[model samples]
Target chain A: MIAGSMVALVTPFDAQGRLDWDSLAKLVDFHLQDGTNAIVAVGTTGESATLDVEEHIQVVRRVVDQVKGRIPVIAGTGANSTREAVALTEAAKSGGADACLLVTPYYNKPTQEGMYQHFRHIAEAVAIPQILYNVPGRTSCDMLPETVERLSKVPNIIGIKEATGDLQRAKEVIERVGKDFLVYSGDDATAVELMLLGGKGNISVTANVAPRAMSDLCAAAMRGDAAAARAINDRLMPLHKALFIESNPIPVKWALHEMGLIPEGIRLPLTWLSPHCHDPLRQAMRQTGVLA
Target chain B: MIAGSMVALVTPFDAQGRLDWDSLAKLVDFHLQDGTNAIVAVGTTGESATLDVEEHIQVVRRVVDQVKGRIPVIAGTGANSTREAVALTEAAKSGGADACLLVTPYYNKPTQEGMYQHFRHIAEAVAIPQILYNVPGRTSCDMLPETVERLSKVPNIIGIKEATGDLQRAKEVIERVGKDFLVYSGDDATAVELMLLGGKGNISVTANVAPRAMSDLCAAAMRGDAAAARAINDRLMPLHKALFIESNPIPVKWALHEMGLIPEGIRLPLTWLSPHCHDPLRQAMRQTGVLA
Candidate 1:
């Protein structure tokens, strides 16, 4: 059972609008060196929607290739359609990744049973352990804890990355699901709260820049060190809020670029963070000590 | 310019789960006879997400053929990717669609500017009268009234299907945009309220069953007949709540199936409504005279 901070690793693209293999490899290396417990590739933070299927698999394989037996690499292979998500899950399995994070069908607005069928089909089809991601904030489909409890019974459906940002729901899942069923907080703002309750780890966006700090924070929370987790969380609160000032990856990508880590390249339909939205992000980054 | 009650038509399916073109044609005929002012084909109501591109345009063309240009047929051609949305828009235009209802790019959570760019690209690429459908309930992204005002200025952009269920935002759009800019309420629950406040028409789900009542209600509201609109809206209030007992089209489809308007076959990623949730829908359907 993977726990603690798993960075939803951002995919770096060169100024030429191509994947920067060197930067990506360095990212995996950096996470390996840091206290980050796992590496989640091509998640929402990784721009899963923008990348085509071939590119998605290539990115996932590349991360597994670069990590070289270091940590678990969870690839995001979610789609609005059941067949598409199933196909992507199959591809993720073939790519030598540890597990796959299948987001609830977004935009398509499936019912609880429909979502259940969608996940069950993928789980039954693929042999790999799967983590369910419920980011209703991004996906527009809220998968209730009731549904999670039902899915938790399935052997291959090992864990869930709960991004509802609702603490009650998080606690409810922790209490209802079996002890072996892991719950990872997908929201940075409420990660500590969810983790302090019973979250296994934080699948975080804030960790993209402040990796070691996030890892330590989650470690503190996971081990039930309330004071230590609170201390770290207090300092990172501004950052947790700021990274989401616009949307996930927009500000984080810009912060990384400002730190001279990644080039200034974001996909269309997701433009660069606005100039007005930059100052708050920079101030938060400075407070977090990622920026000098 | 088209106005009044527009039914976001549901696509009928055979028992074997294939598209029932015979039922589909019957539905078009039913709408034409039942006071439905306009027809919105292959929309979210019609399972646009599940239909492949060929099926999507086929349904659109078929609807156009059935309507025989008697009433406006607005095709749902919205896609998350700008390129895909643009391509779909072109297809919708190529088909004999009077206008196209392009829902806000769901799931991806595009910024206001990104959405502006998205719609701008589609409107520029295709010379059809385009109506923006902003249902943040289904598409996690909310295009603000300000964005609507900006979009209204574009030549080919003609209308919007605001389904946020926020009256203030709807009123703001109606007030800010020019008289030539049309605003349609996409929510059945609040469609009367929106139309009473200068909305041109209702692009409705309730209309799928009670087309005559919805058409009369919208007509009453369109001509500022508050007494008549409220009387009908009050009757439909229960139906509005019941139809959405599950995420839309689930209960609506179930209701239709119960009424023998369509067969009991909804696609995957969207299942048949549960038996437990059937009572309220049946009660509402009977209350509204949609079921015997």
Candidate 2:
């Protein structure tokens, strides 16, 4: 079943803010050991906005190489422009990604019909499987379930990472799209509850810090073990909430750096977590047993 | 002095969506004759997202040349990356712009501190006058007025284009920043109200169609003639509200084309106004007397 936690792996940066392949490899190994179901590299949680086209593809390639068929690696290959997104999907396919996570176009803000056309064009052009990402909070463009269902008919467009955080809407999507079309939660804060309400999996930011707990939590939820999943989720809920104290990956990257998983190097336009948020994030880690 | 209807000018495009120089000159002339005050070229309303770097700078340069000191030309020179924004600001400076309006970083969703740092860096880098544009609805990054105050101290960071449509917050910014730090309403529908509540002017999308009415409305409001301003605003309210029925420039551009002001060509990812929206826009245009 697709119902589990998919760690939205951060593209580790060296002290100089360049991609750290060594640390990335270590992260992959860590996730493999922790039993994460899938890995999504370069999603919004991975700071896809800052990465140039080459680095974007490079990050996906390295993750695919390191995973080495142990787990699926979904590349973030969405752009506001349709042509550009198609080009990115093509690059992701060539980079050996198992599938591509296509975020709805941001900034330009296409209409529903435009979005349907945009996704369908990409899916038709690329033979690889595509999971639509509808994080309207970040994108400011919501791909409605009707539009998602329309795109689902496209052969290669298989699933969606629904980050709206509206359980009712998620329920509607699951009901309308059926069980075969995967519907994952892109939000970490509500991942467990959403999974219980028919979300297929979580493309998570929290997994970067608390991978084992998130994995265990998702696995439990997938098997209809709500009580067990809630137990683990309650333990890790602070981490989920704290990682987004600022924005996705900003606090999460800091948490990872504190854990010594990667060097403290997030690129520009995205600064380090403010000193004010440090105490709370630390408390989150200590409560979850990641820190002494 | 920053009061009145400010036009965010469209970059005239030929049927093939290529920039048309002669048409742009004519459009500038039309605004001047129609009583527009300050002008912003290549703003998001002008389809700045799709315009490449060269085209963006060229449009600003050409607009400056055509305006020829008739009105202030505020160049839209914002980007998701700070470095790119700085480069564009420098180009705008060389291109003879009166000021540059920098939109908050979109997609990246920077923290408030990051936004402060980003704007501070640009202000420190560029010697020209700067206006921060906070359209979180489009950018997905809200720059709080508190951050605005921090940037206002940077000397070149002169003002802001507040498009959040939250008048209470606008009042807070006006009260906190004081009258010297200019505050312009970016939303046309609320320009009069924002101006009456101490906003400086409007970086208006509506000005593209009914420049004379918007300019008069802003002028009246600036003079504390609330009654006179309200009269003009009431007459033009339909135009302001309907122009955004699609997105900013989509309906506005189509309206302009219908008025025989420019050719009908908007860039990709942002198509022309759909036929269904045409009737509503036509009603608004007729109500505002921009059409029969």
Candidate 3:
């Protein structure tokens, strides 16, 4: 799959919780016209947990259809049940997703072996390019470097999203998984660090609002342009730290709506960003030039 | 809700992954006769994630039916989506569950306020007794003591299953929520410590095979009988540590099958226990007299 500043895109819902198709199309164009190299649709950032099966595939289909091959589109198809994951992956492949980002099974807390089986099963069953996602912060199941190295040989299981935010482990994974496997930072805070250490790209929540900056940071970092990368990263630092004030998509979606990019609509269980978070996020948005 | 030595019961499945109803009935009878305080049907231990909506409700219904009001039944009705959780909770209520155990919204990473609203919504909607469950190891979201204190004020939001195993937080929670709000230890290893620090009882995975020991431990610990509690807990200690060699219910289920109480059937994403784990667990079970 294509690399560099892959946007973990947020699904925009209007205040009434309607899936806003027009805004989605607009957002894709904004990223494509800007600098995001790939788009991850219906990912954790896109509220995959709340979406029904139909809505999940619909969003992936829309994102793929909207991207129109301008950029690689990876759909989030991770599930706690291996069978459910396979079913989701098949649908993602059918929806024309360029790849499927399979987070290690969450809530169910699959063992490392269970995760290997989960991803391997999906990779074998679905012919699509597969990116193994290891976000222990959200999934609670850390797909270890040894396990990732083991899985690296599986055909079509191309890359991994290492979201642990531990740079040493990132370096270990990069060196150990061999040069053939792709390493992308899922944690925005350490994206530049991971990139500087031979990571291919960033599957980023920060990329959603500040796409160009994230893109520049990734390009600079990946190219070993340390001075330039640090410069860009310095300017975008607040955003990397602040967006996680209350989980991804929560603060990112709120920032987008504040920028008037998407409407003020986030699904329930995940409420509209807390009222107090607005001021700090607005400040971060302004710092990133996404707002005044 | 009746709280001593509650077994977060495992729902037995046959080799083909079908619910083993005969074994399920047998397990409930075993718990009742052996002094297990309550039965949490379809909890994380019971593979709540793998079970589809109907299967989930069916397990809860079956547990409630089998228990026949002999012990309190807390159905695990947690979902990332508020509506889905509400639906599950409504179904659990209809299943005649004595109470519902709502684990914090997993995967979605709901904010504290979102969680407050999630449980508060359920509390207001379903008049049945409710117990809050915070298992960050599995759920990835830690519901703080402050949040627990906030939720305690809400009517019918009675107790919490503090699974974090953070004794300080558990102590603060017990004190902050006061005596009115039930504070139960969700981690068996630290359950004795929590109970010693004024916790009510353990919502245990160890109870699956050694119900009588867990019950005795809870009794001794809750009565502030440290010597007796430590003695019982010491023998059960190896079992507590070993049963989580993988994830909960993985080792516990395997132990149960070895004890011949349940069949060797665990669903996907959660595979059966590996061969290497058997010898040590058998050793622990034998030490505890569950396997003779």
TM-score result, candidate 2: 0.93
For all predicted structures, in order, the TM-scores are 0.93, 0.93, 0.94
Interface RMSD of 3: 1.1
Q: Which stretches of candidate 2 lie over 4 Å from their true place?
A: A1-3, B1-3, B14-16
Candidate 2 chain A, which ten residues in sequence have the lowest lDDT sum?
A: A1-10
RMSD of 1: 2.3
lDDT of 2: 0.84
Once superposed on the true structure, which residue ranges of model 3 sit more than 4 Å away at CA? B196-198
Per DockQ, the best of the predicted structures is 3
In the range A1-292, model 1's lDDT, one tens digit per residue, is 7888899999998876689987887777777887788899988889887787889999988888878777788989887777677788899989999999989988878878899988998899889999998988777778989999899999799999988889999879999998899999988887898988978899888888899999889888888999999999999999888988887678889988987778898876788999899888888899889898
Candidate 2 lDDT, tens digit per residue, B135-173? Answer: 888877798777888887888888899989899988889
Q: What share of the true interface contacts does each candidate keep?
A: 0.67, 0.47, 0.83
lDDT of 1 by residue, B92-199 (tens): 888889899998877779899999988988888889999999988778889998888999999899999998889999888889999889999888888888988999
Question: How accurate locally, in lDDT, is each candidate?
Answer: 0.87, 0.84, 0.87
Instruction: DockQ for candidate 3, please give it.
Output: 0.74
Model 1 is docked with a DockQ of 0.61
